[PDB]
């Protein structure tokens, strides 16, 4: 079962990389304070929630930062110029609405388009916030350094599928949190991390990893799903279950284990071939300290890093189940390759 | 004064070129039936509302059709392919939501984007409606020929400025209708037309023009407003008043008259230099039958033909006033150049 | 006040990345041994100077390595081929003098130009050291691995502005050093680090960060200043004060504090929008161990990484004042974002 209302709330709560404290951080803390033995916030802004247990020591990470924008200029006529935080594609900004977090509250701006008869790149991205002068714009609360996000826009397309900005990674943050709320008996000593600044170099998990010092590390990010024009170069598909990579970033014995957990609980599990260190928190967890046994558990989505990221609710539900089952079944074990 | 609620309603009511009967037509008829002597709908779908009077015979036209999309393909996996109705730019479709009018009601779809590592044109525009098969998509109500529009999204940015799809031409349809509701005493014999199929060749006004046979014809469309990257090649500016073109499509004595009406009522009036026959209903009105004395009265907007068209409410209000004043002050006159 | 003689000396002292021991290290050790409680040199060459105090533990880093050149070949005719250590532009080498540190003392070389009628790249970079044969060059003290720098050339242009190779980062090393010298009572437990190998991966601040384990970290590097042909994309300006970034790498609470310090001491303070993890020592400090509260304090300069790096003495003076003031005002406080 999926809680649509809570999911929507977690997806749309403010928090670009480096600015997770604008909303999502407190929302996450307020949900986990009730179920975790202890909840802390570190100097980088990570939310670390301890679910006390015996062994092994297990870290789970789902990043709460969104890709977004920073204002770096305001011109005489009151237009804004912006620059990306994280892998924003400028092509997805044309004729779109941007949600800004100014000092007088949330405001909106609009990225225009040039009518054909007066005619891809970041210098063409000029934000219109409804002002006539630099002074009016400043008075609205706009500053050099003001942060913006894709305007919220949640759409259920069918019974199962839905499109919204920022499924990466709010969809896995939601699944991770949900699995934690339902967490039953477990031998493992579990740390649930809502990591910070993942979209700009995995920095949150790097630092939380150092603090916690786990034996097992599991990252919950989204992954690419088969979509139009992918040239058939994408293995996972929407609606066919959660995904767990295989490859160098993936500890073989941990990956084997998760497979059998899935078999026992009869949860469909997809394979994603990953020949490189992943672009997830598992990358830096694996090379933390003396080494960590790591894996990636992901929800497949279409249209990664756009206002229109699309998932299947059956994959979300199954991801919650497998996350829960894994955390409960995890026991001391030989992870040596 | 501007009625934000009514404006929003008129802007968002369904009606692409050739399909104004999906909503906007009845909305317009229902508003004008109360104030007009007689309201008719012609074979092309035009709404013609007569406000009886003496002379001259005056036609006013604001088009109620929107640019939009038609589905022309549904593939095995349930994706849609679409083609434009009117001057839709494909660049404005990336990561956008489309509102569809299917046979089982309104549904939504989403135009994806291709993640960078697997890489402007219409064959790249594939619509995702949350289906898995052609059959599921058909069952949803999708057909070859299903119509779609930009998803509604009204945003007031500041006290005066607001951005939304389809200000062209719902913003002038609203101003025109509003002026008609407030219409006082007038010597002129007035026909208020909500024209059809303007974005694909001015066809509605061509035909309504023939039926009515006016001596004076006035078109209310939107026009380009000064915006970023316009190379300073746009004269009108947001917030500096309604616009009335000057040029070959504009009868000199009618244009003179409107100028003095504006002076008397002290409504700011901008000039737009138009050396060609205009891309408005005034084009075909002027060459109707034995000739018609024509002018263009427009509201300036930024970002023409995108989801993010932007206007200034002060221009809207002033447009209502000048439209009203002109209709009341209009009297028999020598229009001979 | 700025000490021109001391500033010049610190700027022109030898020390390319990995070879900071050729001069700058001892000059730094010699100056701070007089004011610091303790001075150590680590395995990579960082100079770490302890200024005892209570809390918080504060690391300040100004890098003492310069970008430079390494000889990787000597041909039969005694010419050298070189390769860059750090972000050297080959364009800045045409018709320039190079200072080399040979086994027989400092020597000079020249990178030529080809007269046009005989006609951008590293293969066009051939150094002429005045030799006729490989042996003569060898006998002169030149080896594969010989290190070279931009020849020193300090010039005061006006009362406040001056241009020289290697303001990056000797100008902030100088500022940090002066601030330490003038340091009064302070609650913070202060470590002044003159770091090693910054222009090639922030190595050194990475290791010093680890040994010191601070709670607060401040980098003093140079930053870009508004200059000709910058497309107006550079916010900070010469003469308008020190600069402090805002963005993910900058702890919001520390940044707010520093702002407050500036206001109280009436020191002009600029903002630089930095949406990425910075290209300064603060990048690795932030992700050191369990995380650090970090900021960047920088001097604005023109023509970064060239022989004519150019600064304003008023910004230097103010950077010292702000550096001093910050270190004295710093106290325990909650840095949680
Ligand atoms: N599964 C193991 C035991 N299951 C219990 C369980 O599902 O954990 C018993 C009941 N099971 C109900 C069901 O799962 O639909 C029916 C038989 N199953 C077939 C199937 O997998 O559907 C065979 C093996
Ligand atoms: N306008 C014609 C007559 N107006 C009446 C009217 O505005 O139709 C008289 C009152 N008018 C009030 C006002 O308009 O603000 C003040 C004087 N106006 C100045 C102005 O235009 O502002 C001078 C000429
Ligand atoms: Cl990721
Ligand atoms: Cl038009
Ligand atoms: Cl640097
Ligand atoms: Co991402
Ligand atoms: Co149009
Ligand atoms: Co540098
Ligand atoms: Gd550019
Ligand atoms: Gd104010
Ligand atoms: Gd079963
Ligand atoms: Gd250890
Ligand atoms: Gd094509
Ligand atoms: Gd059916
Ligand atoms: Gd007046
Ligand atoms: Gd006639
Ligand atoms: Gd080469
Ligand atoms: Gd002086
Ligand atoms: Gd520690
Ligand atoms: Zn992610
Ligand atoms: Zn139009
Ligand atoms: Zn530097």
Residue numbers in the entry:
A (entry chain C), B (entry chain C), C (entry chain A): 1 to 119, 129 to 346
Would you copy out the relevant sentences from the publication that reported this structure?
Among self-compartmentalized proteases, a new class of dinuclear metalloaminopeptidases complex was recently discovered and named TET due to its tetrahedral shape. TETs monomers are all formed by a proteolytic domain and a PDZ-like oligomerization domain.
PfTET3Gd crystal was collected at Gd LIII absorption edge. The asymmetric unit contains three monomers forming one apex of the PfTET3 tetrahedron. By applying the crystal symmetry operators, PfTET3 dodecamer is reconstituted. M1 is coordinated by residues His314, Asp177, Glu208 and two water molecules, while M2 is coordinated by Asp177, Asp230, His63 and a chloride ion. These data suggest that M1 is occupied by Co2+ while M2 is occupied by Zn2+.
